[PDB]
Amino acid sequence: AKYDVLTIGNAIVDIIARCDDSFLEENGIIKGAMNLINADRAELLYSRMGPAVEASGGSAGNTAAGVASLGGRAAYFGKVADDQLGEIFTHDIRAQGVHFQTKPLDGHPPTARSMIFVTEDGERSMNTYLGACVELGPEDVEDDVVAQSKVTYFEGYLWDPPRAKDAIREAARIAHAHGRETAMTLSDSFCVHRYRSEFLELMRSGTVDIVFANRQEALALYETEDFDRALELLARDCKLAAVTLSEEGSVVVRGAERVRVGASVLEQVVDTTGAGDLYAAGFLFGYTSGRSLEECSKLGNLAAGIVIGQIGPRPLVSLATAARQAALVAENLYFQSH
C-alpha cells in the first residue's frame, strides 16, 4: 500500500463572501444547501456578490488536503481545465503533498467553481457550476493508484455529472479486488433526495463499505424524522458509518455499537464550509493507521473544528504540526508540566 486515502470528487474552486439572510431569499438560494447552477447563473450571482476571496475546495478534494495535513498519505482524482483556475487548484492540492496527476481538459468547460455565501451564523450556501467536472470519467482512474490505497473515498456529489458514477463502479472494483476499502460522503441533503436509490443500492451491493453523512442527510436517506430508526437502517446497509452532529460532535455506527464522541467548544463559528469534509479527513487518518472508533471520532471533530474558525475549507498549514504545537504552547502558558 502507497496511500492511506484516495479521494474522488468534483474539482471546485471556491469564491467566497459574506452576505445577510435577505440576500439569499432575494436570489432564491437555498440556505445551507449546494445549489446547482449553469454558467450564466454563475456570472449573474458573481456580479451581485461583494468582494470575494478564492480558495480551492471540492468536498472530496478537501478531505484529501485534510489527510495529508493530519500526517497521512493521500491522492486525488478530479476534473479541471487547462486554465488559471485549474492551475491553482492543481497547485493547491499538490502543495498539500497529495498525489494529483489527473489530466486537465484543454479549453471549455473551464474549471468548476462555486459561489459560496456565508451568513452571520457561519452557515454557508453554495451555488456551483460544474464546468470541467462533467468530463470526469473512467478514463481518469489511475489504476495502480486505486490499488495502492487503503481507502478510496468519493462524493455523492458525483452523481450530478454524467459519467462520474462509471469512473466509480470501476475504482470500487479495482480497490476491493486489492483488499482495500471504499468510502463515501452523502454530500448534501438534496443530493440525497436526487439519488436516494442510486446511493442505497450502491451501499447494499457492498460497492461502498463506509458511509459519512450529517444528520439531515441521514434522516433523508431513509425518508424519516426518527433519527434512532435511521441509525439502524444505516447500520444494516454498510460495514461502518460515521454521522456528523454539528456541535454535538459525532455518532459512529457498527451494528448495535454506537460510539458517541463530542465536539470541541469553538471560539467562533466563522465559516462552516469544509467541516464534514475535514471531519472525515481526520477520521480516516485515524482509521488507516489503525485506531479506535473512539480515537477516530476524536480526530474527526478536532479537524472539523479547526477549519470552522476560518474563511475557507482547507488548513493552509500542516494540522499535524499546528495541533501538536498549539497544545504545547497552552501547556507552557498555563504553567503546566508536559
Added chain:
Amino acid sequence: AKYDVLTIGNAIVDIIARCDDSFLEENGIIKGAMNLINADRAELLYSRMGPAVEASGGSAGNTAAGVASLGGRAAYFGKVADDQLGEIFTHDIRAQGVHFQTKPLDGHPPTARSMIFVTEDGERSMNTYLGACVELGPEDVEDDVVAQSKVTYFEGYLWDPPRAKDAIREAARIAHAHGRETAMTLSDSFCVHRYRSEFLELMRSGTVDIVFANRQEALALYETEDFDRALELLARDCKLAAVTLSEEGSVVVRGAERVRVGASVLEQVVDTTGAGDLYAAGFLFGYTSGRSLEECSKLGNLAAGIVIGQIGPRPLVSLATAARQAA
C-alpha cells in the same frame, strides 16, 4: 468633482501562504521586500509554495478599495488581461463600488500575480510577476476621470514597468490643470534605491504634491540613518507627507509642522500585507472630506490596523462601519 480618490497602480492578484524564515533564504527572497520575478521564477516558486489562498491585491488597488469601503468615491487605473485572474480582479474592485473601466489586454502577457509569503511574525515577503501590467501606459488614462477626482494617487512601483511613468506624468498634468492634487507612495525601500532620483524630481517639480512612505523608505530616500534629518528634507520637497511607523503609528510633515498619532493597539498581527495601503486609504478619505491632519492620521491607523489582523490585503469588514463605531 465626482471622485474623492483615483488610484493608478500595478493591477495584481495576490497568492498567499505561510512559510518559515529558512524557506525565504533557501530561495534567496528578501524578507519584507517586494521581489520582481520573470514568469519562469513564478512557476518555480509557485511549485515550492504551500497551499495558498487568493485575493485581489495591488498596492494602489487596495488603497482605492479602502477609500470605497470607508464611504468615499474612488476610481482606479490598471492593466489586467482578459483571463480568469483579470476577471476576478475586475469583480473585486468593482464590487467595492470603485469605478474601473481600463481595458484589458486580450491574450499575453496574463494578469499579474504576486506570491506573498507570510512568516510567523506577519512580515510579508512578495514575489511579483508583472504580466499584463507592462502594457499600461498613457493610452489608459481616462482624462475626464482624472479631472473629476480630488486626489490622484499612484504607486512608485510603476517605475518598474516600461511606460507606466508616462501614463503618470500625464495624469499629474491633467490633475493639476484642474485644481486637483496628486499623491504617491514610495512603495518599497528597494524601489526607492532603484529610483531615488526620479522620485525626488517628481516631488521637486511639483508633480507629486503628497508623499506616502514608511520609515525604512523615508530613510532610503535620503540615504541617511538620521530620522529627523530625513523628515526635514521631505518637508522641503513636497506640500505634505505622511510617514507610517508600524506599532508607533504615523508622523505627518508639513513644513515645520509635525502631527504624530499612535497606532491602535492590536490583539494579533496576522498578515502585515496591505498596511501602508490602507493607511493611505484612511488618510485620503479623511483628507478629501476636509479633515484635520490629526483625524486623517487616526483614520489611516484605524484602517491599517484592521487589515493587518486578516489574511488578505483588503478588509473583509465594512470600513465605514468601523470608522463610525470608533467615532
